From a paper:
CoA is constitutively bound in HypX, which will act as the prosthetic group for CO biosynthesis through the formation and the decarbonylation of formyl-CoA.
We obtained diffraction-quality crystals of HypX with two different space groups (C2221 and P41212 for Forms I and II, respectively) under crystallization conditions as described in Methods. Their crystal structures were determined at a resolution of 1.80 and 2.40 Å for Forms I and II, respectively. The Form I and Form II crystals contain two molecules (chains A and B) and one molecule of HypX in their asymmetric units, respectively.
Residue numbers in the entry: -1 to 544
The structure:
């Protein structure tokens, strides 16, 4: 009932972090060992002497020395019998209607071990990373729990594979987007199967690129392969039967990084003109809406779909513009929803890494996100709510915390700390926000913890205000119901009374200004001072090896 569990992962990735939260918070010890070398793996296992080894995320054989001596269970993102290193990629390229996940034993043949548990699910037409983070992750969690229960019994015998098949590593030629030959559906299937790695190769404006994060376009039309418009740095490209938006691209070179399309395409883009759509406009056709504002039951909902939850300096100002709009509206509550897969991961480290001066662009980014946080804070006459449908890390968590109420879906993983990015001091009014919820001592413990915590755990420690919902859709409905109830009550007006008296106080208003200028002073030293931890850690996060 207190098992010692060793994780063998290539990287401590989203699924590995979620499993670590699920097991740790059920009182098991989990040691995490990143795949460096087979000799080092046998070493780490021999010291730790686990009762059970889980491989949430592997790129290569586990040494037979380890799994013939410790029970080793492998995660595989395919249904029983599916073998190979790109299971999801193939499932999407082939158009599988039904898919699944398999927890199988380690064996001498790749993925040929007996099955300990599996789940199946219906497949959405969506990015590989979104399938992985939702259906695959929730399914994996169920298999691992059912496997830990069967391990306790010891009277469990796994099921050998029957029908099986092999899919090899998928080559670039198969993902290559050809605009004259590929319809919109085919472009989306190729980009979906390659998002977020390795990307679909293509040529745009005569430049060889990798495509990322596609969206169908039903109004704009033109010459296939012709760039039709810009819109918040995304480009819309003619296909064989219509058009598609591509928000992010990467030059096909060693040192190049994923960036918004306009930054990759650059001066190659001069003829093209913007085609704006404000978030509050209503639209009858499918197009790409980075930020979306809709009103339901006297409630203002701000969706913001920032790729990978990274918030560029410019995306912060686009968001602030929408919060200012929402604040002049006949609405009683304003709810920041983020996206389904991410609430926010703070500053965009890719646009920072790309800038002429990363220190300068860091200065811009932190002041832009602080401007968003200050605007939320300065809402005396409305209720402010953060709805975390997906994961959040670093500054993105503390953005959420400036809202009056913070809710999250079950299974959301949070990293409210800067231990991965050179120990930035942090801003986003955390010195005002965090103590008001957990106290200066526990808040420091939280920011000192480099391991993840669940949405469940954050509820306990008072970090957030409630956790519910299994899916993003479910969580959204629940959140709308709960907020509609509250503003349709007398409590809402008694809540606002206090908020109005305190928030328009010159005491409070200058208290938060001291906090901002305090955090920004610390962050300025991180950005510009002798210790360069931040820039070293950014370089490796942004350019990590796949
Ligand atoms: C939060 C975090 C621990 C989540 O870990 P994880 O579950 O393993 O998620 P990943 O690192 O795989 O994120 C997936 C993608 O989002 C990107 N991403 C996540 N946060 C990002 C950020 N702030 N800026 C730029 N890119 C980011 C990642 O590079 C990765 O890119 P890819 O899939 O295209 O290869 C981790 O992503 C992180 O530390 N992000 C940076 C947060 C930060 O330091 N912001 C600056 C201070 S506000």
């Amino acid at each position: 009932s207190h098992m010692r569990i060793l994780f063998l992962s290539y990287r401590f990735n989203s699924l590995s972090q979620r499993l670590y939260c699920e097991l740790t918070e059920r009182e098991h010890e989990v040691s995490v060992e990143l795949d460096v070398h087979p000799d080092l793996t046998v070493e780490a296992a021999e010291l730790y002497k686990p009762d059970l080894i889980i491989a949430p995320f592997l790129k290569r054989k586990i040494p037979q020395e380890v799994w013939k001596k410790y029970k080793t269970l492998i995660i595989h993102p395919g249904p029983p019998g599916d073998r190979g290193p790109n299971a999801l990629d193939w499932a999407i390229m082939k158009g599988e209607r039904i898919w699944g996940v398999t927890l199988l034993e380690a064996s001498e043949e790749y993925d040929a071990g007996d099955v300990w548990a599996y789940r199946t699910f219906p497949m959405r037409f969506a990015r590989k990373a979104s399938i992985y983070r939702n259906e695959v992750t929730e399914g994996v969690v169920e298999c691992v729990l059912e496997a830990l229960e069967n391990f306790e019994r010891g009277d469990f015998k796994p099921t050998p594979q029957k029908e099986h098949w092999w899919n090899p590593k998928m080559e670039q030629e198969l993902r290559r987007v050809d605009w004259e030959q590929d319809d919109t559906k085919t472009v989306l299937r190729k980009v979906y199967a390659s998002d977020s790695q390795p990307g679909a190769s293509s040529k745009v404006l005569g430049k060889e690129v990798l495509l990322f994060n596609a969206y169908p376009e039903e109004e704009l039309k033109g010459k296939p392969g012709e760039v039709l418009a810009l819109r918040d740095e995304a480009v819309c490209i003619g296909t064989r039967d219509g058009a598609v938006w591509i928000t992010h691209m990467r030059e096909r070179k060693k040192e190049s990084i994923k960036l918004p399309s306009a930054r990759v395409l650059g001066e190659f883009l001069k003829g093209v003109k913007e085609d704006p759509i404000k978030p509050w406009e209503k639209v009858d056709f499918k197009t790409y809406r980075e930020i979306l504002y809709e009103e339901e039951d006297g409630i203002g909902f701000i969706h913001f779909n920032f790729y990978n939850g990274a918030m560029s300096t410019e995306q912060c100002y686009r968001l602030l513009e929408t919060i200012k709009y929402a604040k002049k509206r006949p609405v009683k509550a304003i709810v920041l929803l983020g996206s389904e897969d991410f609430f926010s991961n703070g500053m965009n480290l890719n646009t920072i890494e790309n800038a002429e001066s990363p220190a300068d662009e860091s200065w811009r980014n932190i002041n832009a996100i602080d401007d968003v946080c200050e605007e939320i804070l300065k809402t005396p006459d409305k209720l402010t709510v953060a709805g975390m449908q997906g994961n959040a890390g670093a500054g993105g968590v503390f953005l959420a915390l400036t809202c009056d109420l913070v809710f999250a879906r079950e299974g959301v993983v949070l990293n409210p700390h800067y231990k991965n990015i050179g120990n930035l001091y942090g801003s986003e009014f955390w010195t005002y926000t965090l103590p008001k919820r957990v106290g200066w001592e526990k808040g420091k413990e939280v920011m000192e913890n480099r391991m993840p915590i669940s949405s469940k755990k954050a509820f306990e420690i008072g970090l957030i205000d409630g956790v519910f919902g299994k899916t993003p859709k479910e969580f959204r409905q629940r959140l709308k119901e709960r907020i509609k109830n509250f503003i349709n009550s007398k409590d809402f007006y008694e809540f606002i009374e206090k908020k109005k008296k305190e928030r328009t106080s010159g005491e409070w208003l200058e208290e938060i200004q001291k906090c901002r200028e305090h955090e920004l002073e610390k962050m300025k030293l991180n950005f510009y001072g002798f210790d360069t931890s931040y820039h070293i850690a950014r370089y490796y996060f942004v350019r990590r090896k796949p």
